[PDB]
Amino acid sequence: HWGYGKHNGPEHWHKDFPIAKGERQSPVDIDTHTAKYDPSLKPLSVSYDQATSLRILNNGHAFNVEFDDSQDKAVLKGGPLDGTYRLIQFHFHWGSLDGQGSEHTVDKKKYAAELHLVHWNTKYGDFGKAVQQPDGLAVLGIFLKVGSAKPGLQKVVDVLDSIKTKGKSADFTNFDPRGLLPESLDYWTYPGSLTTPPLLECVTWIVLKEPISVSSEQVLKFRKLNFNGEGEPEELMVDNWRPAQPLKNRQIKASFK
């Protein structure tokens, strides 16, 4: 099945998922000089005060922090979006080294990691229906650079020993995702896709310009996770990023000058 190895990685995915070669695939390189300011965009509205985290799961590709998405508790609105999008999970992509790991790039620069906060459009009732729609999802992408620790990330890092291998989950209640956001909500936006199979072209991407800082020690913990299940040969969960895809007939818009 698909993964991030030599025989199963991103250049292979098209064989099982031909949309991998589609018209609106993600991630992309954000060419900052060609993005255009769009004064009609709004500020984004990130309303996470009522968020209810439930569980953290090693799914063999990443770890997901899952939320209760059965009511409007943690929602994204505004910006480029029409309507209300509910937070379902967040996860990361990261590298084996600090010079790689992000999926989006900025002027070809790769960050150490990238956080995806995944939200679905409430007009479609559930996640599985939303991914079948061109405006089904909104993903807030946040770059990670290595420097000072991110205090709000530590409780995530804390629990990773308990979900080392694929298929392991742990209770993860009362986690506040506000502690993972940078100071500024300035962003770029464009229409794209899931960055993992099934690669569906259902995402409005909102990529924040300001990275968060995490410490070496925090990233190093990410890199101790395993892609394998328990009692299988150990293969470190690193370099779980898809590279930039062709922009094709898209314009990236900026919320800022």
- CA dihedral 173→182→105→236, nearest 10 degrees, is -30
Q: Cα separation of 107 and 34, whole Å?
A: 10
195 is in an annotated binding site: yes
Q: From which experimental method does this structure derive?
A: X-ray
Task: Check whether 12 is labelled as a binding-site residue.
Answer: no
All structural domains of the chain with their residue ranges: 1-257
DSSP codes joined into one string, the chain:
---SSTTTSGGGGGGT-GGGGSSS-S--EE-TTTSEE-TTPPPEEEE-TT--EEEEEE-SSSEEEEE--SSSSSEEEETT--S-EEEEEEEEEE-SSTT---SSEETTBPPSEEEEEEEEEGGGSSHHHHTTSTTSEEEEEEEEEESS--GGGHHHHHHGGGG-STT-EEE--S--GGGG--S---EEEEEE--SSTT--S-EEEEEESSPEEE-HHHHHHHTT-BSSPTTS---B-----PPP----S---EES--
Q: 1 among the known binding-site residues?
A: no
**Strand pairing category for 53-58 and 187-192:** unpaired
Q: Which residues are catalytic?
A: 61
Q: Which of 115, 107, 112, 120 is nearest to 90 (CA)?
A: 115
- Give the C-alpha separation, 67 to 89, whole Å: 6
Residues in Cβ contact with 46 at an 8 Å cutoff, skipping those fewer than 6 apart: 76, 140, 178, 181, 185
